[PDB]
Design a protein around this nucleic acid. Structure first.
Ligand SMILES: [Mg+2]
Lengths: 106, 287, 14, 295
RNA sequence: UGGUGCAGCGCAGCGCGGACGCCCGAACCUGGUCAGAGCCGGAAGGCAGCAGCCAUAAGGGAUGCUUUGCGGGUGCCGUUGCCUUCCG
């Protein structure tokens, strides 16, 4: 049930219930339909879950703040350590900056 | 009720614009509704009376001669669902001084409901008083204080191993200094039903001597909740039922088999007064 | 209000 | 026969339905509304009505009672396409995937079916796949414990996709003809159930590139529409090659067989019509229909 | 004859540098422990392995009746010898 500390305390709570669906707990707005979130049980079928939650915990509690300092020698680092590929790491690194960005405009 | 409704709505949808129906066709919908109740974990006996009820009503409204049978059946089931919930809305009686007990198993929002019931009458011009009866687990009375501290209702915590006599001594005193016209005694709650617990609840009732006994049961259990109410009403003596978590429940085998089995009218429901007529519509897709 | 509604809802894309 | 309650709307039921009736639009409707009761299926019934009208028009029919010799033919061909007896000879061992939702009659069928093979003259080895359900594993062990039937079981919670392997490996060395094994059956997670069973058929190709040989499906009949939804799920999960309708006798919904044989076409293996082990004769088309319409 | 000024050694102290002890400490390519994750196989059970944590180099800092080398505007210390010049 400044941002990095919040990301972990949040993502960690995004597993002990599903992948849960509490996405509709702090949103007074309305939804769309039900035949759409059905593709959420698909990823659950596999013995695994997602690649994101992999290389996510495979990083220092300071390397997630400014992933910009990460180079070609740092991407392959959290790549083999998590089992993912260099490409699967980029999509993850280029996101940590988005959260800390779009948040500023909020 | 997602499942329940989804079964009934379609059960009648097959008769949406089919002209005059035959006697054999009428029997179809009857059984189609039966299974809709079975899967909804509804009492067998209640399931029969439900189907049989529609049988008489249908034949009484000349459904086998009506151009639009989907309209007759819809109105028929509506009457069955409404009566299956209680027929008409019912609420506890109020007078000079009131005092009830909030008995129930642990994990059914027994403590949460007691806090909501106090805030309800509070806005109606009443003066409730949350009083924990639990004397085994101190944490039980601790959870009631927080709830009463947010809603704005005074909570009276009892001591550990305190005799019922000593309780009534303070509950009656604190109700005089602050002038309380309502006392919500929240009894202790456990996972299962044991004799030792059923014994303390009975003695505590012979002392204070309440007027009505509300039982907060879980609707996410179905017939299971009914069996639980079959004990309290035998060892203690309940007068009403408060089904909570109705949203999570997609069946409704405890709400459609309450007035029949236990026979206890559902006053409140998890929080606002239970409206049989209202819920009867949401099931048919019109609430 | 609307924060992660347009954020986490995009993590399933990749 | 134990189908009296089933013949209330089927077979002999049509007799009192077309009794003194004239073949017309209002006639076919009165029939379709009766077929949708035995859970025959909307698509199935719709197909029967059309094939019936065409046959009751291109031959000039003015008697509804004459339709008797029509439905018995159409409804007979539906099961004739899924009428394929089960053979378990030649192969050794013979894996028999047992899929189905928990609480349907799987563990019950595995027992009766096992007593059939040994009765013919062949050894059989059980295998409690679904470890999560100790209620089933405990029964599969205590049972074969007195029937001298070998049962393979492990720690509660082990991989059910391997409980079968242990039975197969211990079958080629202990000489075993028939090899039956149960699996998990939870609809709560469609995906999981898919990959779970799918990862079982892709691994049994080690000791036998032909195993599993049969993908039996245990579904209840009294359920009605439920029996259709379940079979449809397992059909999209793995390659079903056999289905068995249990608890058919005792309910007026035996017409579900026409839905799990037309909409799917999966050749029905066995059929339940009682409680005894003998009350489970192989699926027969020119037999079930002959008794279904038996006046 | 004598009083200063000497040089080279022998004892303390001081300054600097180098060890020991303490603190901090390099992304990985060093090690142990390794949630999550990933890999291998039909399982039971393993392999590989990142962050964090612990320990530990290079490289610094504070401090040390402690230990060592070197370097001098310490000191009324005792004595001998030599010497440009100065002073009785
Ligand atoms: Mg008494």
């Amino acid at each position: 049930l400044l941002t990095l500390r919040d990301v972990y305390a949040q993502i960690i709570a995004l597993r002990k219930m599903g992948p849960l669906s509490k996405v509709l707990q702090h949103i007074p707005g309305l939804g769309i339909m039900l035949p759409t979130p059905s593709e959420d049980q698909l990823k659950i079928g596999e013995e695994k879950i997602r690649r994101w939650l992999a290389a996510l915990n495979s990083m220092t509690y300071k390397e997630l703040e400014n992933p910009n300092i990460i180079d070609k020698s740092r991407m392959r680092r959290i790549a083999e350590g998590s089992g993912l590929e260099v490409e699967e790491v980029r999509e993850l690194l280029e996101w940590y900056n988005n959260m800390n960005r779009l948040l500023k405009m909020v | 009720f997602q499942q329940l409704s989804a079964r009934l709505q379609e059960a009648i949808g097959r008769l949406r614009g089919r002209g005059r129906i035959t006697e054999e066709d009428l029997k179809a919908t009857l059984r189609e509704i039966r299974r809709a109740l079975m899967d909804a974990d509804v009492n067998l006996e209640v399931t029969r009376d439900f189907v049989e009820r529609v049988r008489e009503e249908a034949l009484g409204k000349q459904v086998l001669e009506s151009l639009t049978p989907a309209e007759v059946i819809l109105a028929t089931v509506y009457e069955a669902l409404k009566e299956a919930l209680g027929g008409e809305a019912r609420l506890p009686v109020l007078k000079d001084r009131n005092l009830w007990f909030l008995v129930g198993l642990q994990g059914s929002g027994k403590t949460t409901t007691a806090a909501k019931l106090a805030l309800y009458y509070k806005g109606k011009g009443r003066r409730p008083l949350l009083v924990a009866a639990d004397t085994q687990r101190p944490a039980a009375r601790e959870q009631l204080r927080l709830l009463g501290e947010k809603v704005g209702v005074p909570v009276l915590e009892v001591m550990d191993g305190e005799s019922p006599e000593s309780i009534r001594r303070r509950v009656e005193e604190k109700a005089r200094l602050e002038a309380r016209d309502l006392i919500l005694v929240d009894t202790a709650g456990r996972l299962q039903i044991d004799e030792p617990l059923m014994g303390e609840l009975a003695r505590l009732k012979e002392v204070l001597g309440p007027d009505e006994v509300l039982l907060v049961l879980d609707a996410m259990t179905g017939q299971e909740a009914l069996s639980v109410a079959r004990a309290f009403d035998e060892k203690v003596g309940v007068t009403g039922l408060v089904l909570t978590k109705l949203d999570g429940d997609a069946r409704g085998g405890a709400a459609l088999s309450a007035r029949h089995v236990t026979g206890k009218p559902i006053y409140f429901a998890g929080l606002e007064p239970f409206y049989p007529e209202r819920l009867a519509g949401r099931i048919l897709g019109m609430g | 209000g609307i924060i992660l509604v347009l954020l986490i809802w995009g993590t399933v894309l990749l | 026969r134990s189908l009296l309650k089933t013949k209330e709307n089927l077979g002999s039921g049509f007799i009192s339905l077309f009794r003194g009736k004239k073949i017309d639009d209002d006639l076919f409707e009165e029939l379709e509304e009766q077929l949708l009761i035995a859970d025959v299926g909307v698509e199935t019934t719709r197909k029967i009505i059309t094939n019936l009208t065409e046959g009751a028009s291109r031959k000039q029919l003015r008697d509804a009672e004459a339709l008797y010799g029509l439905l018995k033919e159409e409804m007979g061909e539906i099961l004739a396409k899924v009428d394929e007896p089960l053979n378990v000879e030649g192969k050794a061992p013979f894996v028999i995937l047992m899929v189905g939702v928990n609480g349907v009659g799987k563990t019950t069928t595995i027992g009766k079916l096992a007593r059939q093979f040994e009765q013919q003259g062949k050894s059989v080895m059980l295998a409690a796949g679904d470890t999560f359900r100790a209620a089933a594993v405990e029964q599969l062990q205590v049972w074969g414990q007195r029937n001298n039937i070998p049962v393979i079981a492990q720690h509660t919670g082990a991989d059910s996709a391997s409980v079968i392997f242990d039975a197969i490996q211990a079958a080629k060395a202990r000489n075993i003809d028939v090899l039956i094994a149960d699996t998990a059956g939870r609809l709560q997670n469609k995906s999981h159930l898919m990959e779970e069973l799918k990862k079982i058929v892709r691994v049994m190709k080690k000791l036998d590139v032909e195993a599993p040989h049969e993908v039996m499906l245990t579904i209840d009949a009294s359920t009605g529409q439920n029996a259709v939804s379940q079979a449809k799920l397992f059909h999209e999960a793995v390659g079903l090659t056999g289905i068995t309708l249990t608890k058919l006798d005792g309910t007026a919904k035996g017409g579900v067989i026409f839905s799990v044989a037309d909409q799917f076409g999966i050749p029905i293996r066995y059929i339940g019509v009682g409680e005894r082990i003998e009350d489970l004769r192989p699926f027969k088309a020119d037999d079930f229909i002959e008794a279904l319409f038996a006046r």
